[PDB]
Amino acid sequence: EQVCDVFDIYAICACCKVEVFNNYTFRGLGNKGVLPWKCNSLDMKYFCAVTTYVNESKYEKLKYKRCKYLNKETKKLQNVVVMGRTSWESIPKKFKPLSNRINVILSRTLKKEDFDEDVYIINKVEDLIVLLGKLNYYKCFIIGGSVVYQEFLEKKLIKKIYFTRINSTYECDVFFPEINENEYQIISVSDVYTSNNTTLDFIIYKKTNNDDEEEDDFVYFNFNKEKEEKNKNSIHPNDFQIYNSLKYKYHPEYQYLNIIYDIMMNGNKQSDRTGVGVLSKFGYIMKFDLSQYFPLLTTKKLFLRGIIEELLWFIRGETNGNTLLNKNVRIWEANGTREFLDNRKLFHREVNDLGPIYGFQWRHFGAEYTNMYDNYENKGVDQLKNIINLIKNDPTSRRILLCAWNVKDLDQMALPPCHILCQFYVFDGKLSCIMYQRSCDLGLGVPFNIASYSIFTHMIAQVCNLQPAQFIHVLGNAHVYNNHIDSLKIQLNRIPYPFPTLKLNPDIKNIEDFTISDFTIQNYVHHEKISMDM
Amino acid sequence: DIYAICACCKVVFNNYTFRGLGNKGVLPWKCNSLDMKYFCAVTTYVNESKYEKLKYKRCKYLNSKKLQNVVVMGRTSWESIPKKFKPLSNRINVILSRTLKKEDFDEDVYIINKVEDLIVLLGKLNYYKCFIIGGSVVYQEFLEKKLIKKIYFTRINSTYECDVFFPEINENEYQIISVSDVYTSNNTTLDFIIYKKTNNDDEEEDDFVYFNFNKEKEEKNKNSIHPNDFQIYNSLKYKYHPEYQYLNIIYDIMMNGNKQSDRTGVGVLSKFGYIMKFDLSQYFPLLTTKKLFLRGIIEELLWFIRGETNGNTLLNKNVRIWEANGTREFLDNRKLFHREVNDLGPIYGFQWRHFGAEYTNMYDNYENKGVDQLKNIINLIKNDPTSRRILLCAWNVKDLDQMALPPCHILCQFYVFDGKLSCIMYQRSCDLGLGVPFNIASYSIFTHMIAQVCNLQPAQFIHVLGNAHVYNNHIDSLKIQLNRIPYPFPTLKLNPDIKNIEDFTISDFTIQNYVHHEKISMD
Ligand SMILES: NC(=O)C1=CN([C@@H]2O[C@H](COP(=O)(O)OP(=O)(O)OC[C@H]3O[C@@H](n4cnc5c(N)ncnc54)[C@H](OP(=O)(O)O)[C@@H]3O)[C@@H](O)[C@H]2O)C=CC1
Ligand SMILES: NC(=O)C1=CN([C@@H]2O[C@H](COP(=O)(O)OP(=O)(O)OC[C@H]3O[C@@H](n4cnc5c(N)ncnc54)[C@H](OP(=O)(O)O)[C@@H]3O)[C@@H](O)[C@H]2O)C=CC1
Numbered sequence A: 001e002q003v004c005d006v007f008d009i010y011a012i013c014a015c016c017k018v019e020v021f022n023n024y025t026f027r028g029l030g031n032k033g034v035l036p037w038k039c040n041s042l043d044m045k046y047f048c049a050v051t052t053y054v055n056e057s058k059y060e061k062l063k064y065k066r067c068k069y070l071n072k073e074t075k076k077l078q079n080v081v082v083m084g085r086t087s088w089e090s091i092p093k094k095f096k097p098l099s100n101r102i103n104v105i106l107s108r109t110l111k112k113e114d115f116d117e118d119v120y121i122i123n124k125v126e127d128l129i130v131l132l133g134k135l136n137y138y139k140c141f142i143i144g145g146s147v148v149y150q151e152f153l154e155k156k157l158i159k160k161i162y163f164t165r166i167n168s169t170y171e172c173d174v175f176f177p178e179i180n181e182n183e184y185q186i187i188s189v190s191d192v193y194t195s196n197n198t199t200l201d202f203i204i205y206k207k208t209n210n211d212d213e214e215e216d217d218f219v220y221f222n223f224n225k226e227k228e229e230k231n232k233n234s235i236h237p238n239d240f241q242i243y244n245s246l247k248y249k250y251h252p253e254y255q256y257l258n259i260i261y262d263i264m265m266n267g268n269k270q271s272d273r274t275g276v277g278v279l280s281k282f283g284y285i286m287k288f289d290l291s292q293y294f295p296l297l298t299t300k301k302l303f304l305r306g307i308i309e310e311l312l313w314f315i316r317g318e319t320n321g322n323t324l325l326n327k328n329v330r331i332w333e334a335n336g337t338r339e340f341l342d343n344r345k346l347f348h349r350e351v352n353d354l355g356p357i358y359g360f361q362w363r364h365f366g367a368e369y370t371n372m373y374d375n376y377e378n379k380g381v382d383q384l385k386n387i388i389n390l391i392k393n394d395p396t397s398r399r400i401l402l403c404a405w406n407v408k409d410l411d412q413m414a415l416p417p418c419h420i421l422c423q424f425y426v427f428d429g430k431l432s433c434i435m436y437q438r439s440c441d442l443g444l445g446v447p448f449n450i451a452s453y454s455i456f457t458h459m460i461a462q463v464c465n466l467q468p469a470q471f472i473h474v475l476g477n478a479h480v481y482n483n484h485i486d487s488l489k490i491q492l493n494r495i496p497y498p499f500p501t502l503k504l505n506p507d508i509k510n511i512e513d514f515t516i517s518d519f520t521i522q523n524y525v526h527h528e529k530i531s532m533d534m
Numbered sequence B: 001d002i003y004a005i006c007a008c009c010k011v012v013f014n015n016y017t018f019r020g021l022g023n024k025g026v027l028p029w030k031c032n033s034l035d036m037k038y039f040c041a042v043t044t045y046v047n048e049s050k051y052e053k054l055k056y057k058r059c060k061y062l063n064s065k066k067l068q069n070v071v072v073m074g075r076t077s078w079e080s081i082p083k084k085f086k087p088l089s090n091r092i093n094v095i096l097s098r099t100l101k102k103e104d105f106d107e108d109v110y111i112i113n114k115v116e117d118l119i120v121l122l123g124k125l126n127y128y129k130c131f132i133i134g135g136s137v138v139y140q141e142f143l144e145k146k147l148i149k150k151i152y153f154t155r156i157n158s159t160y161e162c163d164v165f166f167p168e169i170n171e172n173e174y175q176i177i178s179v180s181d182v183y184t185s186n187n188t189t190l191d192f193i194i195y196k197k198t199n200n201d202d203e204e205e206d207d208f209v210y211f212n213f214n215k216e217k218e219e220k221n222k223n224s225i226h227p228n229d230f231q232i233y234n235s236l237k238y239k240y241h242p243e244y245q246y247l248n249i250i251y252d253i254m255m256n257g258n259k260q261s262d263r264t265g266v267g268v269l270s271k272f273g274y275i276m277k278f279d280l281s282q283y284f285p286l287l288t289t290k291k292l293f294l295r296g297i298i299e300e301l302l303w304f305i306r307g308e309t310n311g312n313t314l315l316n317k318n319v320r321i322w323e324a325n326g327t328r329e330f331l332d333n334r335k336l337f338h339r340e341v342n343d344l345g346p347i348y349g350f351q352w353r354h355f356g357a358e359y360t361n362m363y364d365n366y367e368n369k370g371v372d373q374l375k376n377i378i379n380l381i382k383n384d385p386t387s388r389r390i391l392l393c394a395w396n397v398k399d400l401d402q403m404a405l406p407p408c409h410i411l412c413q414f415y416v417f418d419g420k421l422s423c424i425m426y427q428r429s430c431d432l433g434l435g436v437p438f439n440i441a442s443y444s445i446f447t448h449m450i451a452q453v454c455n456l457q458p459a460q461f462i463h464v465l466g467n468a469h470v471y472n473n474h475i476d477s478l479k480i481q482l483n484r485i486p487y488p489f490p491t492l493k494l495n496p497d498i499k500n501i502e503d504f505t506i507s508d509f510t511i512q513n514y515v516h517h518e519k520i521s522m523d
């Protein structure tokens, strides 16, 4: 029975990045006696919530345990907070003492007499442990600063860390102690939020190894499922240790990563026209909150330049592969070759002429396609203009779809579009986008697709004078390639970082007027590159 | 800790419609492999590391370690069991009796003089919980003697011959608090419901609260609905019946939906992006919480497949789904001043068989003009099962303005695996109160139809909702529906002989064992 479990001693801190990314990139605590960031409202509200939360039921078990360990026998309940003097003098004087909590301050230079407020002054750690045997309290929170943090981990007196990752860089002179992957391991990671123009999430470290007759009902109703051998696929335990060890997976990136797992664990084995080899499943939905982040996957490096050039290329209505290839974007290069077009029976189509695909269908749906050099001036339906006009003027229309699946033109296309349709939704001056994907490459393709349509929602929202809200991705045929597996296993065992943010040059007001430099990914912190294949 | 278990089949409907227990000293149905397995696992399970708390309960009322449960039946129900089955493998069997004695039977097995004298053995024996498989009279005797504190009821959704029945459970005295998944075994639908006696690292649970620190609802009703009215809904512990996919999206939109006023000014709660998945190999998902009729939507489905846009064809069969959209007035408001009345334009039927053709009028022969997409998806299912290009798309962008209205149902996508066919239908605009029930049936049928002509087995129908709305003046009606407890789902029997998608006729479609609550007027 170590002292932290009996007396429930925890740390809560908030760290920013300081002027190969790792989890000791988040480590900036304070600058010139204050926070590097000035105020974070959500970091504050989380801190208030965690440190002021008690549950009176549980107390009697704790009051017991505490009497057990400490060889003893059988106001409204509060938690303890414990801070350094510097940290205490850093607090606004109307906010001190921290309300509805037991304030404990570590100081040598200052005795009790030096303090007006209702606080407990102590001059060493051993004394805190004394006071926690003398007091009625729920949980003890160590709230810093740097010296108090370092000391308490030093003595292995902390049982969990409540770690806020403020996903921006600021000037810092005090740092959080480095954490050993050995001694402490992340068991939980939260949703990403935006506050005060930065993203943040909340992760929990744990100290490492080194009315109750209706429980059963669940077992009954689960009598007809699988075995461990009708859990379909062999793909083992150990190979997702860090994934399965996680308790709460509330980061949105686990939306994508859980589907990987479901396909891997529960996928159907198929071999396409190719003779390749996949695990596939049918019909999922991912919702991302664009108002709170830009969901660029963090469990591997992603380059956004090419997929942005491609979006602008569509918006122009271009079907000309050369255009991309001059800008050094090879997305559509293998779909533009003599061989590929010849195997598509497109014998009369020019090299890199991809035909009536996204560009055309968005600007000119149902015009007879000629070649990539034709301007289709006022021919067919300008869907893109149409949807921008319906968002402006009829935001409660249920007919705001942009659709790339023109049945008439499929055989004329290099490939039929994987991204069938975008439908739009407007509420309270905010814009959401459903995108339906017929076929989905989970290992290589979906990461870019999420980003792509996520940027497109921002673009539309901007020129329609609305705020971006939810991007909703609907997967039809959801497959993992068999050779993608080894690399996807590596990725599932990586804990996401807080998402980056996307900034669009605000001056752009028409959908046609966006250039590569109008886009900026701020604060993309990410695990290292993975070659999906081998 | 005394609960009964049973299976009951059929003999307008309420819950009690399920009562048939026995025919001529045996079961009305022959034998159900999954009902026996459930029945088995319910009485094969004892909570390992719990119940020392009932060495401090039963012994503080009445002043080995293999640890099975009791399994209390009667002579009539002891004689009913086959020889090889008895005694009930790995269970403490009792028999309530008069005529029997312990000098025709063993000491491992037991009997009791009467039900009062059961507590003689109960206050003498060692187990966890008392399971009563009983019978017509061994059940009735534990309802009138209010002994039973829960039932583990199988509902067999078939009608047999019966001499014995179950005692009608008392509308107040007991109430269902859990409904299972619906399944198929021995060519019947069945589900599993639990009835209750009315009272009339523990670390990482605060971690939950801390993560739940930024959720809006401070008791302030996010929407104006009074959940105090879904008491039966909110009471339900496990809501595993698939009809709860529908009902749970009704709940969500009511409680968290955005208040919007349409053109008319009608008023709706709306959300964006849902999925419902129905397992058509275990049931036909025809909502049970309100009477649904299907002759109309099946005839609408045949019409589409024929390539018709002639409204009159449907109206002459008293299918009026497309009536209001055919009027001089509706077509004029669509700016369709040159469209004949009940000429609905290049809608579903025209797009399914002639996508890209130039629509003339509803009477023109379009034979061999435009893309025959229906034909093409059936060919793709057949010649390219593993293709990811198997779509049937009714949203032709060049043709929208020519249509009486654009298709509410955008596209069907088809997946084939291990001789089984699953279908996604993405719906752009979803009236949850009225239209979506029909949408779920209409497209579930379509899957069965496509599956049979392709020599495949229906697997999943998957319903994707875009703009998902409840009309404000449906709210009272849906609140009623949310407190009704789904029945077991019916089945769909397609005439096995029909092998062209185009050869189906209304008579080739029978819904079977369709049990449902009274009809509701959404208003
Ligand atoms: N981002 C965050 O979550 C947090 C940030 N902060 C920031 O961190 C900085 C303050 O932390 P840092 O400068 O280390 O200062 P600390 O808050 O850790 O204060 C250290 C001082 O407290 C006293 N102290 C510490 N340990 C003991 C001990 N064992 N016995 C007796 N006294 C002890 C001493 O005071 P004395 O000199 O009187 O002996 C010591 O000099 C500020 O910039 C503040 O804004 C603070 C908390 C949280
Ligand atoms: N659906 C299900 O889960 C199950 C259904 N069944 C079926 O249903 C029927 C089984 O039950 P049902 O036929 O009533 O038979 P029961 O199970 O009700 O058997 C009751 C027997 O116990 C004795 N008894 C009855 N009342 C008393 C009393 N008040 N005091 C003392 N002894 C009493 C009598 O035996 P005596 O006087 O002769 O000693 C009587 O024959 C069969 O058709 C069987 O196949 C069987 C099991 C499960």
Ligand SMILES: CSc1ccccc1N1CCNCC1
Residues within 6 Å of the ligand: A013, A014, A035, A043, A044, A047, A087, A090, A091, A092, A095, A143, A144
């Ligand atoms: C604990 S010092 C403090 C004093 C006054 C307000 C907030 C803090 N916090 C908690 C949020 N994270 C930064 C430190």
